[PDB]
Amino acid sequence: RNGDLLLDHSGAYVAQYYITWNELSYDHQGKEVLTPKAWDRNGQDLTAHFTTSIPLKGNVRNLSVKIRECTGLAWEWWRTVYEKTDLPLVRKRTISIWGTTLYPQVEDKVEND
């Protein structure tokens, strides 16, 4: 079950993503293994306008998407703008964020029709 995770950041604030998942695999004895995987830009400070597409394989399990907005300097405050765990692996999911620092907004769009 191929899938794509599209992210769009148009908000007037610094955002951070934390996207992790497991890949299902079988060893030379053929029993189950879940391999932790993560987006390479996890924890990176991102500012508008930013877009990306993350390809997700059919053996992907335990998809977790965490989106935070940040503030402060040397040390940062954060509050969660979006957070879902064990997201259904669908054909195409688009998560878009926008708005202001004090009023961040988010849309999660699923397409698996």
Amino acid at 50: F
How many residues does this entry show for the chain?
113
d(CA 39, CA 17): 9
Resolution value in angstroms: 2.0
Experimental method: X-ray
d(CA 89, CA 109): 13
52 DSSP 8-state letter? E
Q: CB-based contacts of 87: which residues, under 8 Å, 6+ apart?
A: 63, 64, 65, 93
C-alpha separations of 14 from 8, 25, 53, 65 in Å:
13, 36, 19, 17
57 DSSP 8-state letter? -
Say whether domain 1-113 belongs to CATH 1.10.10.10: no
d(CA 27, CA 31): 6
User: Residue 55 in contact with residue 1, Cβ under 8 Å?
Assistant: no
